[PDB]
């Protein structure tokens, strides 16, 4: 299969006066490229896909594709939906507008059965000829793609190449790669990036890398070379910020940190997301002081 | 506060060749009216709100309003979204098209904080002048509206009048009505309708009533009349069907049962929902045989 692996960033979506700040977005993507990131993920969970319109989802993908041209950096477009017809539409748009692949979250809220998840992803995969990465995040979606369903989809659909796991379940990571070692297991949980990579995972789709792209890139590339001492050292150093960036629901802490770092102009969300509490604002600020944050 | 309480049905949405079967929908609502139901809820979770378009969500509300006009039966329109701007748009449409109130699910997938939930629902409640019922279902949304947030919304916003609880947590039900006895607590979990009503809950928004509207409305009316012996008797009789209707994710079993009863023409869902397993299909059919199912 064709694949998108390595160190990848779930891009935040900056707003100004309620609209997508398109210049800021392109600028933030350039900063990721310049700090060793292998791929960017526009409009995932961290990018507030829920509150963007379909048009804005499409715009953000286009900005990422245009910004990455002439570089090695890939665009793994956020194209998921809890409605299969919507997910197919977003997948097709991403393919026709030059994305290298798509990330497709398990349907949220309507809790499909494993049979329904299989048919959902089969319909998406049959609709494009670019790579598709599954994305399991049960704490947000209310459902879990089982190991059996992931393995069946990987084996049955030529362009489904692996899964982004955000489930805090290293037993499942062992189960996946022990029964199907050819898939690309991708960490979607920054605190346990190193354990996932050391069991044979082949990349990360990171929140922390919005702020510290050089550290996440270094961690991943050390691990892929089996330089596990160095990769573990960075993973350990990053633990405190990796956890504080979830002191409130992602992306509230990461946007707060990007604002505190001067990397975005305004600390704006779309409702129902909003600014953190004053106490957590202070906690985020305090933890940031322990890390060197690259500018532009 | 203006309120919508009593026995209410979370209407299934029948499909024919992939489209909303509008004549079937109207026929199903008339059947609810004939069997003592006090209000209907178009396009809630049970109505496959996730896979309807915004236009179909609006069409179903219109059909409900029109079918109920000139009867005692109210329309509590499903108008929720995980994006506040979408939720406000749906609320306004329901108001302008004659719904008696709206049901508004807590944002799913993006996990707002309690502050965010307060601002979400305050924005919705300020956009219309009809009653708003909150809706807590953490197993599907990934978030919980806390008791403190519900009570503040009830006290601070004139039209927020209560909450549909689908959380399996009778302790929270006690907490809510012990600290704010003026709110309308509505059962969103059929198996425990009687315990919620016996603690001072004032209605149900039912899945089972799609199939057995006479039994659910009787249960509710016995309880509101303080005949706890008879309300409990019906709740107990209904336990087996109340549980089997969740052997797979709702509304997969209830649509299967409606098809098996001859009340809808075809067993059609929109992906990612799909037909149940053959084993669960047989289980639903077996349990249904023990109940008397009203026709048209
Ligand atoms: N709020 C809806 C629509 C989002 C459309 C853009 N990603 C959802 O989360 O599915
Ligand atoms: N699938 C999206 C859009 C639904 C629009 C109609 N209710 C969601 O679940 O939020
Ligand atoms: Mg197979
Ligand atoms: Mg900015
Ligand atoms: Mg009545």
Both tokens of A224, joined, read 């892929």
Residues with CB under 6 A from ligand 2: A 81-83, 86, 109; B 49-50, 52, 54, 57, 81-82
Chain B positions touching A45 (Cβ under 8 A) are: 109-110
Distance in angstroms (rounded) separating the CA atoms of residues B150 and B163: 8
* Residue closest to A271 by CA, chosen among B140, B110, B77: B110
Q: Is residue A148 part of a domain?
A: yes
Cβ-Cβ contacts under 8 Å for A175 (sequence gap 6 or more): A147
Q: Is B274 left (phi over 0), alpha (psi -120 to 50) or beta?
A: beta
- C-alpha distance from B222 to closest chain A C-alpha (Å): 32
* Pairs from B193-197 (Cβ < 8 Å, separation ≥ 24): B193/B219, B193/B220, B193/B223, B193/B235, B194/B219, B194/B223, B194/B228, B194/B231, B194/B232, B194/B234, B194/B235, B194/B236, B195/B170, B195/B235, B196/B165, B196/B170, B197/B223, B197/B224, B197/B231
Give contacts of B120 with chain A, Cβ < 8 Å.
Answer: 271-272
- How far apart are the C-alpha atoms of A275 and A268, rounded to whole Å? 8
Q: Is residue A228 part of a domain?
A: yes
Q: Say if A270 falls within a structural domain.
A: no
Which residues in chain B are immediately followed by a break of C to N over 2.5 Å?
A: none
Distances from the Cα of B138 to the Cα of B54, B256, B262, B294, angstroms: 23, 25, 33, 33
Strands A184-187 and A203-206: parallel
Q: CA–CA separation, B40 vs B26, rounded Å?
A: 11
Helices (H) then strands (E): counts for chain A: 13, 10
**Is B296 part of a structural domain of the chain?**
no
Question: Which entry of A25, A135, A194, A259 is annotated as an active-site residue?
Answer: A135
| In the block, residue with structure tokens 């990934």 | B142
B168 touches chain A (CB under 8 A): no
Going A156 to A157 to A161 to A167, the CA torsion angle's sign is: negative
Resolution in A: 1.7
The b-or-e profile of B221-236 (16+ CB within 10 A means b, else e) is: bbbbeeeeeebbebbe
List alpha helices for B126-269, DSSP H: 138-141, 147-156, 170-179, 193-198, 213-224, 228-244, 252-260
For residue A170, the domain's CATH number is: 3.20.20.70
A291 in a domain, yes or no?
no
A186: in domain: yes
Largest CA distance in chain A: 49
- A15: which 2 tokens? 């707003």
Inter-residue long-range contacts of B242-246, CB under 8 Å, 24+ positions, other chains counted: B242/B190, B242/B191, B242/B208, B243/B191, B244/B283, B244/B284, B244/B287, B245/B190, B245/B207, B245/B208, B245/B211, B245/B284
B205 is in an annotated binding site: yes
Residues 247..286 of A with a Cβ closer than 8 Å to B: which? 248-249, 252, 270-274, 276-277
Closest CA to B90 of B59, B51, B135, B45: B59
A49 token code pair: 């896909």
Phi/psi at A76 (5° precision): -105, 95
A92 carries an active-site annotation: no
* B26 lies in some domain: yes
Exp. method = X-ray
* Rounded distance between C-alpha atoms, residue B247 and residue B270, angstroms: 19
Considering Cα of B16, then B21, then B24, then B29, what sign does the dihedral take?
A: positive
CA dist., res. A116 & res. A145, Å (int): 10
The whole-angstrom separation of Cα B173 and Cα B189 is 12
List, as ranges, residues 87-146 from A with C-beta within 8 Å of B: 105, 107-113, 115-117, 119-120, 123, 139-142
d(CA B259, CA A82): 24
Q: How far is residue A13's CA from residue A9's CA, in Å, rounded to a whole number?
A: 12
Q: Which domain holds residue A61?
A: 6-237
Q: Are A129 and A101 in contact (CB under 8 A)?
A: no
Judge whether A153 and A115 are in contact, CB under 8 Å.
Answer: no
Inter-chain contact A274–B141, Cβ cutoff 8 Å? Answer: no
How many angstroms is it from A30 CA to the middle of ligand 4?
14
Mutate to test the interface with B, among A272, A276, A278, A280 (most CBs of B within 10 A): A272
Rounded-to-integer distance, Cα A75 and Cα A78, Å: 9
Residue entry with tokens 């600290």 = B179
DSSP element (H, E) containing B120:
helix B114-125
Please report how the helices A84-96 and A114-127 are oriented relative to each other, as an axis angle in degrees rounded to 10: 30
Of A88, A85, A79, A84, nearest to A128 by C-alpha is: A88
Two structure tokens written together for B131: 């009653």
User: Quick check: A171 and A219 in contact, CB under 8 A?
Assistant: no
A287 belongs to a structural domain:
no
CB A213 within 8 A of CB A237: no
Q: Are strands B203-206 and B184-187 parallel, antiparallel or unpaired?
A: parallel
Known catalytic membership, residue A164: yes
What is d(CA B206, CA B218) in angstroms, rounded to the nearest whole number? Answer: 13
Overall number of domains in chain B: 1
Structure tokens, B3: 């309120």
Assigned token pair, B55: 């236009």
Q: Are A281 and A275 in contact (CB under 8 A)?
A: yes
Catalytic residue among A95, A152, A164, A172: A164
Where helices occur in chain A by DSSP H, the ranges are: 22-34, 54-68, 84-96, 114-127, 138-141, 147-156, 170-179, 193-198, 213-224, 228-237, 239-244, 252-260, 278-288
Establish whether B46 is an annotated binding residue.
yes
């Amino acid at each position: 299969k064709n694949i998108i692996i390595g160190a990848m960033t779930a891009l935040i979506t900056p707003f100004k006066n309620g609209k997508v700040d398109e210049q800021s977005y392109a600028r933030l993507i350039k900063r990721q490229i310049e700090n060793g990131i292998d791929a960017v993920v526009p409009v995932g969970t961290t990018g507030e896909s829920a509150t963007l319109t379909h048009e804005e989802n499409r715009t953000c993908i286009e900005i990422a594709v245009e910004t990455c041209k002439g570089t090695k950096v890939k665009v793994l477009a956020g194209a998921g939906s809890n409605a299969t017809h919507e997910a197919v539409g977003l997948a097709k748009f991403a393919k026709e507008h030059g994305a290298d692949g798509i990330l497709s979250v398990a349907p949220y809220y309507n809790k499909p059965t494993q049979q329904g998840l299989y048919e959902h992803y089969k319909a998406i995969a049959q609709s494009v000829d670019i790579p598709v990465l599954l994305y399991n995040v049960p704490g947000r979606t209310g459902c879990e793609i089982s190991t059996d369903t992931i393995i069946k989809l990987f084996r049955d659909c030529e362009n489904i190449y692996g899964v982004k796991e955000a489930s805090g379940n290293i037993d499942k990571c062992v189960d996946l790669l022990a029964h199907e070692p050819r898939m690309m297991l991708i960490s979607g949980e920054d605190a346990i990036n190193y354990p996932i990579l050391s069991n044979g995972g082949k990349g990360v789709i990171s929140v922390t890398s919005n702020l510290l792209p050089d550290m996440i890139s270094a961690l991943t590339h050390f691990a892929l070379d089996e330089n596990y001492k160095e990769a573990k050292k960075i993973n350990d150093e990053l633990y405190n910020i990796n956890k504080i960036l979830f002191c409130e629901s992602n992306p509230i802490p990461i946007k707060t940190a990007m604002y505190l770092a001067g990397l975005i102009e305004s600390l704006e969300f779309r409702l129902p997301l909003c600014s953190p509490s004053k106490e957590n604002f202070a906690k985020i600020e305090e933890v940031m002081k322990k890390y060197k944050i690259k500018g532009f």
